[PDB]
Design an enzyme around this catalytic site. Structure first.
Site, PDB file in Angstrom:
ATOM      1  N   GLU A  71       0.784  -1.226   0.000  1.00 55.95           N
ATOM      2  CA  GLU A  71       0.000   0.000   0.000  1.00 55.95           C
ATOM      3  C   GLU A  71       0.823   1.286   0.000  1.00 55.95           C
ATOM      4  O   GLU A  71       0.513   2.167  -0.757  1.00 55.95           O
ATOM      5  CB  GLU A  71      -1.080   0.071   1.107  1.00 55.95           C
ATOM      6  CG  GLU A  71      -2.143  -1.015   1.017  1.00 55.95           C
ATOM      7  CD  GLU A  71      -3.145  -0.862  -0.112  1.00 55.95           C
ATOM      8  OE1 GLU A  71      -3.138   0.151  -0.840  1.00 55.95           O
ATOM      9  OE2 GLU A  71      -3.968  -1.793  -0.258  1.00 55.95           O
ATOM     10  N   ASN A  81      -8.348   9.298  -5.856  1.00 64.27           N
ATOM     11  CA  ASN A  81      -9.011   8.420  -6.835  1.00 64.27           C
ATOM     12  C   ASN A  81      -9.998   9.263  -7.636  1.00 64.27           C
ATOM     13  O   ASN A  81     -11.120   9.525  -7.184  1.00 64.27           O
ATOM     14  CB  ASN A  81      -9.717   7.256  -6.126  1.00 64.27           C
ATOM     15  CG  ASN A  81      -8.764   6.437  -5.241  1.00 64.27           C
ATOM     16  OD1 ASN A  81      -7.849   5.750  -5.753  1.00 64.27           O
ATOM     17  ND2 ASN A  81      -8.945   6.521  -3.912  1.00 64.27           N
ATOM     18  N   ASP A 117     -13.881   8.223  -8.539  1.00 66.40           N
ATOM     19  CA  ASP A 117     -15.019   8.324  -7.606  1.00 66.40           C
ATOM     20  C   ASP A 117     -14.955   9.416  -6.543  1.00 66.40           C
ATOM     21  O   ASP A 117     -15.813   9.436  -5.677  1.00 66.40           O
ATOM     22  CB  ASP A 117     -15.293   6.989  -6.922  1.00 66.40           C
ATOM     23  CG  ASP A 117     -14.400   6.750  -5.755  1.00 66.40           C
ATOM     24  OD1 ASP A 117     -13.213   7.109  -5.835  1.00 66.40           O
ATOM     25  OD2 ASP A 117     -14.789   6.193  -4.712  1.00 66.40           O
ATOM     26  N   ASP A 136      -7.239   7.810  -0.488  1.00 64.73           N
ATOM     27  CA  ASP A 136      -6.650   6.808   0.423  1.00 64.73           C
ATOM     28  C   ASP A 136      -5.563   7.442   1.295  1.00 64.73           C
ATOM     29  O   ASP A 136      -4.723   8.174   0.777  1.00 64.73           O
ATOM     30  CB  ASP A 136      -6.026   5.682  -0.380  1.00 64.73           C
ATOM     31  CG  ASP A 136      -7.022   4.980  -1.271  1.00 64.73           C
ATOM     32  OD1 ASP A 136      -8.163   4.731  -0.823  1.00 64.73           O
ATOM     33  OD2 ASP A 136      -6.708   4.606  -2.407  1.00 64.73           O
TER      34      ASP A 136
END
Ligand code: NA
Length: 130
Positions: free
Chosen positions: A35, A46, A49, A53
């Site tokens: 990650e 992102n 949408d 994160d």
């Protein structure tokens, strides 16, 4: 901050992650590695949408923490997303434990499936004294 491998392993053990909801320490290590590269200040927007994160475990603003700017979002860890960019990882670990309490468990992160599932993950904890 950017943890060294064994430094993070020891920190996660002290924080009770080893075997939490059936998840071994080496699996948590494999997830942080893919990650964020063990980086607490890592963020990823992102554009598809409108969510972001956050931090060492790349926890998503749609479900887990509040950043105000994500549409239709909830805040299940009851944290500002800012809490997940600190050098002290206590809050991010508390939030990761909340994530795996839902049915999918560690499968919640698609990089765990691609990079960690059904692999020899012993490499992440070898030599760290944990
Ligand atoms: Na949110």
């Amino acid at each position: 901050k950017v943890f060294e491998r064994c430094e993070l392993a020891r920190t996660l053990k002290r924080l009770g992650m080893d075997g939490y909801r059936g998840i071994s320490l080496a699996n948590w290590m494999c997830l942080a590695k893919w990650e964020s590269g063990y980086n607490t200040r890592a963020t990823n927007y992102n554009a598809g949408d409108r969510s972001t994160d956050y931090g060492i475990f790349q926890i998503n603003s749609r479900y887990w923490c509040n950043d105000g700017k994500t549409p239709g979002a909830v805040n299940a860890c009851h944290l500002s997303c800012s809490a997940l960019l600190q050098d002290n990882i206590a809050d991010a670990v508390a939030c990761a434990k909340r994530v795996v309490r839902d049915p999918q468990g560690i499968r919640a992160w698609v990089a765990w499936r691609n990079r960690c599932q059904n692999r020899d993950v012993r490499q992440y904890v070898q030599g760290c004294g944990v």
